Amino acid sequence: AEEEKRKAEEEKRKLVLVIVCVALLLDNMLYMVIVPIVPDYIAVKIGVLFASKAILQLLVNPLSGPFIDRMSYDVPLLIGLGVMFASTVLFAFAEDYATLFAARSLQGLGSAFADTSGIAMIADKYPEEPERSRALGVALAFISFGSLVAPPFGGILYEFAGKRVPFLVLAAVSLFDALLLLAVAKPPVGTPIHRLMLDPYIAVVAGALTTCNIPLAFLEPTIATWMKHTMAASEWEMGMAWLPAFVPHVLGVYLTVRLAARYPHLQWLYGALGLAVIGASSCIVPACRSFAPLVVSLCGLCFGIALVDTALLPTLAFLVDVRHVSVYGSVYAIADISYSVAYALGPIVAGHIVHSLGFEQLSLGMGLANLLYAPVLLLLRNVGLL
Numbered sequence: 001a002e003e004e005k006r007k008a009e010e011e012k013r014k015l016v017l018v019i020v021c022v023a024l025l026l027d028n029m030l031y032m033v034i035v036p037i038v039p040d041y042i043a044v045k046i047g048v049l050f051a052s053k054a055i056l057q058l059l060v061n062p063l064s065g066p067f068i069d070r071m072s073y074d075v076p077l078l079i080g081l082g083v084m085f086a087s088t089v090l091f092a093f094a095e096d097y098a099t100l101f102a103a104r105s106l107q108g109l110g111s112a113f114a115d116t117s118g119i120a121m122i123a124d125k126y127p128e129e130p131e132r133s134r135a136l137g138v139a140l141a142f143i144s145f146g147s148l149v150a151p152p153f154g155g156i157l158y159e160f161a162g163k164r165v166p167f168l169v170l171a172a173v174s175l176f177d178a179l180l181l182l183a184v185a186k187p188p189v190g191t192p193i194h195r196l197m198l199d200p201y202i203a204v205v206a207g208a209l210t211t212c213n214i215p216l217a218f219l220e221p222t223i224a225t226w227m228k229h230t231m232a233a234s235e236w237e238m239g240m241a242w243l244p245a246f247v248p249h250v251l252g253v254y255l256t257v258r259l260a261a262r263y264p265h266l267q268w269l270y271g272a273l274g275l276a277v278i279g280a281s282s283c284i285v286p287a288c289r290s291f292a293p294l295v296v297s298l299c300g301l302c303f304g305i306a307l308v309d310t311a312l313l314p315t316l317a318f319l320v321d322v323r324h325v326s327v328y329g330s331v332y333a334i335a336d337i338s339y340s341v342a343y344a345l346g347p348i349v350a351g352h353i354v355h356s357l358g359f360e361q362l363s364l365g366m367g368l369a370n371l372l373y374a375p376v377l378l379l380l381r382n383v384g385l386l
């Protein structure tokens with residue numbers, strides 16, 4: 001009678017959860033597999049390429065906020081996966097420099113239309129605290145799986161085949177996922193965004209996401225030359241250095257979901273612990289001389305970003321549910337802005353800072369920026385009262 005429709009609605013919930021998580025996995029695969037291929041095909045500006053992706057993702061998101069607010073979620077998710085498919089097909093036969101440039105900018109456009117609406121859709125069909133925390137935890141777990149084990153197993157199959165075959169196969173996989181979303185999904189006025197910068201705790205979560213995401217923006221185009229300069233830097237362990245930093249991320253997301261379920265007041269405290277672990281994991285970086293201490297420092301850094309993201313995105317959706325209209329367009333767009341600011345300031349400025357100032361000084365300044373934004377989360381003792 002009723003339980004038939006309830007189990008059908010549970011299937012329709014879990015199915016779009018698995019589909020959007022696989023879409024996010026392929027998205028982060030496509031972000032992290034392209035970066036060792038563009039310097040092979042040359043013939044600062046490479047930083048102009050990557051920061052152009054991030055700056056186009058920055059410029060679309062306030063303009064795109066009302067598009068997810070004023071309309072539904074299935075249409076921008078379909079637009080996002082379609083633009084991402086077109087970008088991957090453009091990367092399949094990207095020959096000149098302008099081809100790579102336009103393809104990377106369209107990948108940023110697909111980011112702005114896909115990732116924000118996907119994290120909104122996962123946080124829309126769970127209007128309750130432990131299930132929303134579990135769903136966002138599994139979403140960030142697949143995002144971390146992509147961004148932290150996909151580039152080695154993409155580069156391995158890049159070595160002995162080329163690039164024309166596997167990018168077309170992976171774009172066909174992404175279009176297969178988009179057609180499955182079309183086959184099963186079957187396709188109020190919200191709160192504006194120009195007031196949300198004057199909304200203070202939204203701004204606190206935005207600054208915390210930016211300071212959380214700043215080490216992976218200022219270390220991924222940076223640590224590679226620091227392998228050759230100081231470290232022994234074997235190729236198996238230079239290419240696969242980010243592979244062991246996956247299991248602490250899943251351990252951190254399980255700890256954060258478990259401490260968010262058993263405790264409704266310890267989101268922000270373990271989030272400040274996450275910022276503290278990010279700051280300490282940035283400060284350890286000069287002291288490492290051999291390989292495995294650097295590995296465990298990167299593992300601590302990914303543990304910290306897992307804690308911070310899983311403790312603050314349900315807090316962000318909770319704050320939208322408390323104070324404003326229950327829509328999820330512009331506020332995860334503020335979250336994506338908080339990603340794009342760090343990933344825009346990263347690749348251009350990091351190499352010039354290291355070549356001018358030094359790498360130990362940059363790492364200490366980054367750790368001090370983390371640990372001095374750590375007393376900004378003192379204010380979040382007044383959220384669970386609401």
Ligand SMILES: CC(=O)OCC[N+](C)(C)C
Binds near residue numbers: 028143213216305339
């Ligand atoms: C590459 C990217 O989209 O940044 C978010 C991934 N994360 C949460 C692991 C840093």
